[PDB]
Write a protein that binds this ligand. Structure first.
Ligand code: 1MQ
Length: 92
């Protein structure tokens, strides 16, 4: 549900986000929104930060996502995830 033009947007992650990404392998300083979310999901899957049916993202105060009235995300609310992300980076 997010335009391709917008999935292409090249961005630069702030320290907190960049650190999460690198923890999962990322090597660059800049990425496309698509790449950022891709690495975000990889973290989520590797840390199993999700509900039983993998329908909702569930994280803790102890993980890197928590660090990133706590926000709860559903895996299908694309827009909302993008918005939060937009706070953790600066466009290029
Ligand atoms: C808003 C962008 C979403 C976007 C996509 O849906 O295409 N998306 C992804 O591209 C990656 C891809 C992926 C999948 C498996 C894996 F091992 C490594 C990478 O993660 C996705 C995902 C989906 C469900 C769960 Cl429980 C966890 C991660 C999912 C996603 C990534 C981050 C967040 Cl907050 C929510 C959903």
């Amino acid at each position: 549900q997010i335009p391709a033009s917008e999935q292409e947007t090249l961005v630069r992650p702030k320290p907190l986000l960049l650190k999460l990404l690198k923890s999962v392998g990322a090597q660059k300083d800049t990425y496309t929104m698509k790449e950022v979310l891709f690495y975000l999901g990889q973290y989520i899957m590797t840390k199993r930060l999700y509900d039983e049916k993998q329908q909702h993202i569930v994280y803790c105060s102890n993980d890197l996502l928590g660090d990133l009235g706590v926000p709860s995300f559903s895996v299908k609310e694309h827009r909302k995830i993008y918005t939060m992300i937009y706070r953790n980076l600066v466009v290029v």
